[PDB]
Amino acid sequence: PITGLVYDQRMMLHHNMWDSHHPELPQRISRIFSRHEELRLLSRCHRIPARLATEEELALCHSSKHISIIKSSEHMKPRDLNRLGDEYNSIFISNESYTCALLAAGSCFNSAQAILTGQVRNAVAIVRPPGHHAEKDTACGFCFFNTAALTARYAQSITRESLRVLIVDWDVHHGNGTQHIFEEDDSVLYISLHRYEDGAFFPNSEDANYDKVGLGKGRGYNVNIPWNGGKMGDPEYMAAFHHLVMPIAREFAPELVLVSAGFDAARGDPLGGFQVTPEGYAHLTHQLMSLAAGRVLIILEGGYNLTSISESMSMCTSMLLGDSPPSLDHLTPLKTSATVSINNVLRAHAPFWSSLR
Ligand SMILES: CC(C)(C)c1cn(Cc2ccc(C(=O)NNC(=O)C(F)F)s2)nn1
Ligand SMILES: [K+]
Ligand SMILES: [K+]
Ligand SMILES: [Zn+2]
């Protein structure tokens, strides 16, 4: 059983020319990679080559206009970059941003291909910029193209259109883009855990609430787990997996699992305010590995404490490699509002998932 790993240092070239200390740093990915080396995890993986996504592949999820505008940034002058970036919610652009986004996506496609052709069992993709906020027609939240959504459609394109893909988004932020892209789709089950705060937390939309269950044939295939009023950590996430994520996933029977693996819910993150531990992320990963005959791709999203994300993601890879799960700390009583969140979701989804009744 082989675990693949993809990483290319050229994804570091995407940078913030006005604010060089912006938390979506180049070194997010070099740090994670270094920690894999340090722990001797790298040498235990098969290295999967990065490549650029093609414009045709982008069109799996994104409009020509969007692709064209971001493509054009490659040749923009500083003023054009700053103004274009400022047309979006929370975006910075440099001349290398487009190519970096292509590299992130194409890295994940190669990884999905390696999994689906049986060359590896599972894989980790250490990529930036992130993807899950990226919409069909717009950039958002440090994301240009929706890497994970693209990877799902890429997987369908090399297997069959109806290949069942579960996307579990444990980044602390709602994947607005991923929700929307698959909102009318029953082939792609989207499950997101996220800090919501009654819509006050980025990206600040009630779309992230538990009552958005999907539209049309996608009804029941969008699962939002919003957290409110609580510094959520390993007990709340373990409870959500037990009561919601795993029961729904098992019943869906995915053929491929993608993890929108942000590590901004991690203890010490400067933005998330949460306290999931490296060991917590290992248990989450271990649980997902029981799905899809173990066909799991972990895709880096957000996460801004360089130490926290390095420890947390390297622990995930350790789980993929088949190492036994570390012990969790003492699971404090589940926080109250978390029970309330889990109950709301149970009631929203019991109509669609018999395992919930
Ligand atoms: C530069 C500072 C720190 C002032 C700042 C805060 N925010 C708010 C946000 C916009 C987007 C965010 C986010 O989504 N983070 N994690 C992701 O999943 C992303 F990587 F995809 S937090 N903007 N700028
Ligand atoms: K999420
Ligand atoms: K869906
Ligand atoms: Zn995030």
Numbering used by the authors: 442 to 798
Can you quote the paper on this entry?
The structure of HDAC6 stands out within the HDAC family due to the presence of two distinct functional catalytic domains (CD1 and CD2), both zinc-dependent and exhibiting differences in substrate preferences. Over the last few years, difluoromethyl-1,3,4-oxadiazole (DFMO) derivatives have emerged as a new promising class of highly selective, non-hydroxamic HDAC6 inhibitor. The inhibition mechanism involves the formation of a difluoroacetylhydrazide (DFAcH), which is generated in situ by the HDAC6-catalyzed hydrolysis of the DFMO warhead.
